[PDB]
Subunit: 222 residues, 2 copies
C-alpha cells in the first residue's frame, strides 16, 4: 500500500511505469518507500539507502513486507572505511569468479553494470554509495590519479560527466564491470596505461579522474 | 666481509653452500647479516627482517653495501594492519596479472611460492611475515574457518604441519600461488568448498586452519 517496506526477494526497479528499462535492482532485505503514485501496472518507489527512485511492478507487492524498524543510515569515519576496503575489493574478485555479463541496471548480481558493481561491493560492508557513476563521482572526494590507492574509484567518460567507474587495485590496475561493445562484457581487470591491451587502451583514453570514499550515503530528509 | 649489509639488487639465497636450491630471495634494499661462515664459494647469511637463513654466493658480494643505518623493525597495531589489507590483496591481484609460474623459494616476483607470495604481499605495505608457511601459521593468531575475513591466511597441509598458504578473500575464495602438480602453476583463485573445481577440491581436502596477522615480525635478539 504505502510507506516503508522491506524486500523479501531481489526486486527490479524500472525507470518508467511501462517497466521496459531496468533502473536498479533492490536486494533482498533492502528497505523501500512505496508512494501513492500508481500508473499502468506499477507504483513509484524509492529505495531508502541510496534514495534511488523508480517503478516497481504491482506484481512484486507480495515480496514487500511492512517495515517495523525504519531504515537508519550508519555513519562511518574515514578510518572505519579504510579498514573495510579489503572486503570491498574481495567482493569484486569473488564476483569476477562467477559467470557474469554486463547488465544495465544490474545491481544484485551476478550480472552488474559498472556503478552497480561499485555500489554492491561497498554495500557488502555496509557502506552506501549513490547508484550512478556521475553521482559516485560527486559523492567521493576528488583526488589526483597519482594519489590513487587500493579501494579508490576511477572515473571515465567525456569532459561532460562520468559514465563509467572502476575500483582501483595497485600500480595502474583496477577492476570493473564493462560492456560488450568496448569492454569485456562483465567483470575484469584493466590497467591505466598505454601499455595495456585494446580494452585497457579504450578506457584509459576516457579517464576523467579519481575519487576517495570518505563517508557513507545519508538519505535526504523527509 | 662481515656484519650488516643492504642489497643493491635482488639476490638469491640458497639452502646449501653448493647453491643448487633456492631458499628465498632478498629484494633490493633489504638488509642482511653476513656471517664468518664461508664454505665452497658461498657464505652463510641471514636476512634481517625475517631472520631467514641461507647461503649467498660470493659472486653477489658486489651487490652488498655496508649498512650505515641498521634495520629496526616497525611496530604495527592490529588496527594499522587492518587498514593495509586492501593494499595487500591488491598486490596479489597485480601479481596474478603478470606471467608467473610456481617457484619454490620465489619471493621477489614474478614467480612465487605460496608463502613467498604472502610475504611479498604483506611486505609491500611494510608488514613482515616469517618466510615459510609453517612459520606463518605459528606467527599468526589461529582463528576458526568461520571467522575468516579478507586478508586472513588460510593454511593447508598434513595433520603435522602447514606446507601451503593462501590469502582469504571472501565467501570461501582465496588467492594463492600453487604448484604445477596439484595446483595452477602460479597465482590463482580457489574456493574452500567441495562445489569447486578439481584444484579447489584437492586443496580443500588439506585445509588445516586459518590465521590472522596481528603484528609485524620482530627479529630475534642478537
Amino acid at each position: 500500500k504505502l510507506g516503508e517496506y522491506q524486500c523479501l526477494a531481489d526486486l527490479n526497479l524500472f525507470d518508467s511505469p511501462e517497466c521496459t528499462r531496468l533502473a536498479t535492482q533492490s536486494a533482498s532485505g533492502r528497505h523501500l518507500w512505496v508512494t501513492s503514485n500508481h500508473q499502468n501496472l506499477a507504483v513509484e518507489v524509492y529505495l531508502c539507502e541510496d534514495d534511488y527512485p523508480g517503478w516497481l511492478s504491482l506484481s512484486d507487492f507480495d515480496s514487500l513486507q511492512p517495515a517495523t524498524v525504519p531504515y537508519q543510515a550508519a555513519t562511518f569515519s574515514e578510518s572505519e572505511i579504510k579498514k573495510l576496503l579489503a572486503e570491498v575489493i574481495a567482493f569484486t574478485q569473488k564476483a569476477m569468479q562467477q559467470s557474469n555479463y554486463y547488465l544495465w541496471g544490474g545491481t544484485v548480481g551476478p550480472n552488474y553494470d559498472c556503478s552497480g558493481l561499485m555500489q554492491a561491493a561497498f554495500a557488502s560492508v555496509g557502506i552506501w554509495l549513490p547508484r550512478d557513476a556521475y553521482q559516485q563521482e560527486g559523492f567521493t572526494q576528488p583526488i589526483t590519479i597519482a594519489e590513487l590507492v587500493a579501494g579508490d574509484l576511477v572515473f571515465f567518460g567525456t569532459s561532460q560527466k562520468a559514465t563509467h567507474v572502476g575500483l582501483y587495485l595497485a600500480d595502474g590496475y583496477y577492476i570493473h564491470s564493462s560492456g560488450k561493445d568496448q569492454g569485456r562484457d562483465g567483470i575484469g581487470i584493466d590497467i591505466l596505461s598505454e601499455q595495456g591491451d585494446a580494452v585497457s587502451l579504450s578506457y584509459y583514453q576516457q579517464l576523467r579522474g579519481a575519487g576517495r570514499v570518505f563517508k557513507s550515503y545519508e538519505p535526504q530528509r523527509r
